[PDB]
């Protein structure tokens, strides 16, 4: 009983837990839970987009390395 | 009070306000709210169409600049 150990888990349960967490994070800072709008996710996605944009530029430079080879000490 | 300050807002609230703005604007010029047809929209859209045509023409001009430049002498 009590769910001890590392048992397998259903995908339906994964979003369930992640939902209760977001709701709980809001209570600590906004002290309310009506959540007409959910800024937590909106604010999080913007960071993911920035990191993603940075990786794209690195691929560009890596691609440039194959178009016109040259070198520097490393 | 209620409604004061910079609180959050939703997409349904944005159209709701723009509807009230259009409805009140004609009430100042036509003294009736029937709004059988909405000429303000059309008059406004007409300007946007005008602006779009100007941008299209100058991009067309920029397209002309690369196809037959000034430096092709002799």
């Amino acid at each position: 009983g009590s769910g001890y150990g590392l048992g397998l888990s259903t995908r339906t349960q994964v979003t369930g837990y992640q939902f209760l967490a977001r709701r709980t994070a809001m209570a600590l800072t906004r002290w309310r839970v009506r959540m007409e709008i959910e800024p937590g996710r909106r604010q999080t996605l913007a960071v993911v987009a920035s990191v993603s944009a940075a990786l794209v530029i690195c691929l560009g430079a890596l691609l440039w390395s194959f178009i016109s080879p040259s070198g520097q000490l490393n | 009070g209620s409604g004061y300050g910079l609180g959050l807002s939703t997409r349904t609230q944005v159209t709701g306000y723009q509807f009230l703005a259009r409805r009140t604007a004609m009430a100042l010029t036509r003294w009736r709210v029937r709004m059988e047809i909405e000429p303000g929209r059309r008059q406004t859209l007409a300007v946007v169409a005008s602006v779009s045509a100007a941008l299209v023409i100058c991009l067309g001009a920029l397209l002309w600049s690369f196809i037959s430049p000034s430096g092709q002498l002799n």
């Binding site: 691609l63 178009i67 | 159209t15 991009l59 920029l62 690369f66």
Partner: protein
């Protein structure tokens, strides 16, 4: 992006500087159609009818 990369690797260098406005506006135009656009059949509500 591949066409631009293909042209830059070919050495035409025509898209350098101000010439870049063509790929740029096209890329933005595609973005408007894919992220916004309009709702489907189960979204019968819309600004003209609401």
């Amino acid at each position: 992006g591949g066409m631009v990369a293909m042209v830059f690797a070919s050495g035409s260098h025509v898209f350098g500087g101000i010439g870049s406005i063509f790929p740029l506006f096209m890329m933005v135009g595609i973005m408007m159609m894919m992220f916004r656009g309009m709702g489907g059949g189960q979204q019968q509500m819309s600004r003209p009818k609401l």
